[PDB]
């Protein structure tokens, strides 16, 4: 209806290694998450010999996630958070980056 492109949806990648990220599994009861969290989606492997993955939502909490919430409140834009499944940080091996 209104041809106006925008980049409000920004993809975010997060790692569950530092204490600033304490993302846990979704509780089946309550509201599918705690009242103060961010919806985190991760592709989990289904089998060792199969490369197919399933996207499962999780509840994301932590200090850096609170900083991201404040940034979203200030800049007034949405954010979608992912989880890295290939390494923790990533290194330039054979001129190829990961993580």
């Amino acid at each position: 209806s209104d041809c106006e492109p925008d980049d409000n949806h920004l993809s975010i990648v997060t790692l569950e290694e530092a204490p600033f990220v304490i993302v846990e599994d979704i509780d089946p009861l309550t509201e599918t998450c705690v009242r103060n969290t961010v919806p985190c989606r991760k592709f989990v492997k289904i089998n060792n010999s199969t490369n197919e993955g399933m996207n499962v939502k999780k509840c994301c909490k932590g200090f850096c996630i609170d900083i991201l919430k404040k940034l979203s409140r200030t800049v007034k834009f949405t954010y979608d958070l992912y989880l890295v499944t290939n390494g923790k940080h990533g290194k330039k091996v054979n001129n190829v980056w990961n993580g």
Binding site: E31, T32, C33, R35, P39
Partner: protein, 49 residues
């Protein structure tokens, strides 16, 4: 019926973590009941939209 359509829409919004609503309605017959039903559903549920 619209009574279960409202519940389906609420479940869909909950599945996408859309916890804030905006009921923009129009004066049409049979819709006061729908508004009352959706209000009672959102108040009665423990999701807390």
């Amino acid at each position: 019926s619209i009574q279960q359509q409202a519940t389906v829409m609420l479940k869909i919004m909950q599945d996408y973590d859309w916890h804030v609503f905006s009921l923009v309605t129009t004066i049409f017959p049979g819709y006061r009941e729908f508004i009352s039903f959706v209000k009672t559903t959102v108040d009665n549920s423990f999701v807390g939209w």
